[PDB]
Amino acid sequence: KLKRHIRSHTGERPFQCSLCSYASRDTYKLKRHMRTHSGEKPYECYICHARFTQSGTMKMHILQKHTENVAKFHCPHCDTVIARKSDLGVHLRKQHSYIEQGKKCRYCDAVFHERYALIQH
DNA sequence: ATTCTTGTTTTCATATCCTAAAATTAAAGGGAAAATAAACAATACATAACAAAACATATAAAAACCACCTCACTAGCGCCCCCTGCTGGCCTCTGTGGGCACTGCAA
Ligand SMILES: [Zn+2]
Ligand SMILES: [Zn+2]
Ligand SMILES: [Zn+2]
Ligand SMILES: [Zn+2]
């Protein structure tokens, strides 16, 4: 485990994908990459029978599509609710990240440093 | 008639032999002190026999040493999710762009 861990600092990727440029830190990530070229798909969502490449994708599918009463995530800055955490990530990166050079209002001279305040104005 | 050699008994003579008294001298006999020898008895040394102590061999008696087996630890590499975060389309809801019909005002 520690031998495998040290590549997280160094960056060694001693496992090459013979069919593309990808290179993984350990055996499992390479075996998981192989399904995309071979097209093998061992796992199956038992409810809708929709097809997926990856187990975790299926688990998130079940959680968002065939599950009830699941907790959501509220943006701290704005008042909108959205389902997935990673989409809350992309929301904070595209709308509430600090914009260095600023953006000016289309109709007045006021300049803003966050896209949210701009759209709100 | 007178003178001269030669042979044979007589008688002193001078060495020898015999005779006996001295002396004497060595033998020989006895008294006695050494004295070597010898017979016997004692001591010390050497040899042989018996009994015991010391040395060497066998054996087995614990006992020590070495090697193998075995039951673990130590590495080793996948194996398998699993969770978490970024990424790249996707789509639909606001929002950017525009054509154009419509109206209020004042000729
Ligand atoms: Zn590949
Ligand atoms: Zn499903
Ligand atoms: Zn927000
Ligand atoms: Zn403005």
Curated annotation (Swiss-Prot):
General remark: More than 13'00 CTCF-binding sites in potential insulators were identified in the human genome.
Gene name in the database record: CTCF
Domain-related comment: The 11 zinc fingers are highly conserved among vertebrates, exhibiting almost identical amino acid sequences. Different subsets or combination of individual zinc fingers gives the ability to CTCF to recognize multiple DNA target sites.
Disease: Intellectual developmental disorder, autosomal dominant 21: A disorder characterized by significantly below average general intellectual functioning associated with impairments in adaptive behavior and manifested during the developmental period. Additional MRD21 features include short stature, microcephaly, and developmental delay.
Function: Chromatin binding factor that binds to DNA sequence specific sites and regulates the 3D structure of chromatin. Binds together strands of DNA, thus forming chromatin loops, and anchors DNA to cellular structures, such as the nuclear lamina. Defines the boundaries between active and heterochromatic DNA via binding to chromatin insulators, thereby preventing interaction between promoter and nearby enhancers and silencers. Plays a critical role in the epigenetic regulation. Participates in the allele-specific gene expression at the imprinted IGF2/H19 gene locus.
Tissue: Ubiquitous. Absent in primary spermatocytes.
Superkingdom of origin: Eukaryota
C2H2-type zinc-finger residues: 15-37, 43-66, 73-96, 103-121
Result, substituting residue 1 to T: Found in an endometrial carcinoma sample; uncertain significance; no effect on its nuclear localization; no loss of its ability to inhibit cell proliferation
Family: Belongs to the CTCF zinc-finger protein family.
Protein name (database record): Transcriptional repressor CTCF
Phosphoserine modifications at: 38
Oligomer status and interactors: Interacts with CHD8. Interacts with LLPH. Interacts with CENPE. Interacts with BRD2; promoting BRD2 recruitment to chromatin.
Parent-protein start and end of this portion: 365 to 485 of 727
Phosphothreonine modified-residue sites: 10
Effect of mutating residue 84 to Q: In a Wilms' tumor
Subcellular localization(s) per the UniProt record: Nucleus, Nucleoplasm; Chromosome; Chromosome, Centromere
